Symmetry: C2
Subunit: 397 residues, 2 copies
Amino acid sequence: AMLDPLDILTNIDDVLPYYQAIFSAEEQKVVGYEVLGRILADSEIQSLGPFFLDAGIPEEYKLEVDNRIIRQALDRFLEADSDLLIFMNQDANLLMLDHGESFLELLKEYEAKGIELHRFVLEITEHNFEGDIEQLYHMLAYYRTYGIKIAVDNIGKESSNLDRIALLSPDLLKIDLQALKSPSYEHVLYSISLLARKIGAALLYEDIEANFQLQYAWRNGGRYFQGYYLVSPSETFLERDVLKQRLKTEFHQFITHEKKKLETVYEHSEQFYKRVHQAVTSLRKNNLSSDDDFIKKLAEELTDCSFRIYMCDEEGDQLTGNVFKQDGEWIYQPEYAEKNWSWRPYFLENIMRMRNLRKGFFSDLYSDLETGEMIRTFSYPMDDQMYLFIDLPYSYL
Amino acid sequence: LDPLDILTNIDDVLPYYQAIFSAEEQKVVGYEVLGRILADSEIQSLGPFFLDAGIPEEYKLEVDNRIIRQALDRFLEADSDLLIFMNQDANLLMLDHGESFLELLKEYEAKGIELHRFVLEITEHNFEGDIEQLYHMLAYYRTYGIKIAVDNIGKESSNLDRIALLSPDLLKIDLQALKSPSYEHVLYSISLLARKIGAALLYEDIEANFQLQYAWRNGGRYFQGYYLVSPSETFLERDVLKQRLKTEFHQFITHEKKKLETVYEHSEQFYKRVHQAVTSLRKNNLSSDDDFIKKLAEELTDCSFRIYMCDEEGDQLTGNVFKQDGEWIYQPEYAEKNWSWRPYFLENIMRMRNLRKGFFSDLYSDLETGEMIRTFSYPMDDQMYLFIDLPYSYLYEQDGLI
């Protein structure tokens, strides 16, 4: 039914490369192309994808096929726009058979012909590589001295290891959104983008098929985009501005969606600090020496929109019980009035921030330690080196 | 030790324990259950035995069962709120889909140990089986209130997609490896994801001061190691270490307070320098934006290497001015590029437009130059925004900006 190894090795002259355009967030333009293996068989252009991913095929015959596709690709690039990036898949297991010399030579051959080496983006999967990371790293680090870029593919799929990835110090991380097709996957992208920001790697999102995938990509550090939604593979290079208009309008909308969401959260914060300021000022006029009193009085005076309320000093010591709210009613929890919270990620920073601003503010959304529901906590500066804290549920309106 | 010396002396086998410490109170919250054998009048590890590949599972399970039962017996005497950390081999566990082990757990549920006190530590590094099959029985175990800890995070088992899918109650981070480089960045991203999904961090193998320091500054909720308390055969007083930890953390707090304010102070003094420069250069001067930054660059020559301006939506209003090998250059092509996809970009505009002050970004890697930098963001008139990138050569000669 489908292609046989022998169908390809017999018809090696029919083999050709295809190209898929990669687009940028910056200029919403064609930044480069991925070179893909193809074959014209029985009046049909079909994929060499499985052929290269088949372990039954002797490796020497693979190189001879890949060699032809690459030489054609790079010939196409010679007579095109000289700043285009060239995205190529290479098997690191196959590449190591000679320490990547013949491949580097091939690339070195094209530099002399007219292609700067820094245009080459070499796509690789670290979890398919057997043998020492240190041995591979030095090769790629030697590769890097010529400006050859290293992309790492299929992040977090089978034996994917963030530590071995970070060490390879890649120029580019390739992310597919297949495990998105579901609440928790956006935190994964969020953490990845921040990691990539620290280690100095750009994010390319691939296999973008629908509009929501492009949005998720754009709002999680995506610098480069690829997929059917943008452009399918073809044997011809496209105009560099094909999708400029489409994408310019689509990004403006993302920008606008994101700005509004920030306005809302800020608006609700200012309109919450108001409710808390009035209550704090109106009740700190009455007998509540022990701070434990004030809390259970404050919890009642908020519009049934609290959760947990407690006070701390500048070194994170809780000198107040908890006033937990379950089923729209109070609970007093003296037990917690002896804990240190300086270990919590942003705690100390906030205390400091509150002595400068002299204003309250919300944290970002995070999972509540005891319940597990998404919350924000409002921090309020009290008189005499003290700080009020208010845990606050979803707002899943 | 021969596996035969262990198997025929199955009676000498015993559990040991290592305390795990709370961050809030500085007290013991549980004990990891460790396997030992008294052989030739000396306590020895059973680790080199549970690792051995030529010993059939029949026999590993026989020993494991003896240890666990003795330990849960010991727990039945101690405090009713102590956590029980048991490191269980996923392959051994999955031989019967966890059935028998859960059966073992239910028996002690019948004797008065609430299932929510159990912390099942899993190591997915070793797993030969179907991975979503394991997560299936792990999700099932959770329906009884059992807590799930994932092991070797950051190093061998460092996959975000997988942590999130399981969403475990605990992440155990080993700190031997520490003895920022790549590793600290990986831990940092894991730390964030954990705050978002509700997994507490347990730092184990703490055997020095800088490791305890590290755990505490990096969201560590629980701590374990030689530095704190070595493994013994007996439970300790629950406040055994409260005083040593209480003061040792105060040093950490004061060192961090001092560290946070020095950065904050520098940002303040930086803002004043830039405010003078802009207002001075812009006041009574009729020249365009691109000409303005070229002049700003020269005024700030000693502390920057890139300067450019953008509007409310991230559109760059100017080309770049760029300092390459000590001489400023002008790159017009950067005009009209959009930066809104960068993390924090729209958030920062929001902050500037409401705070009406400028500020330093945190340390991040410059994509072009390849060095750790900081960017300074400044709000100007007419909803315009100024960005000044600082070179590593400037940061390192300032106190505390790395």
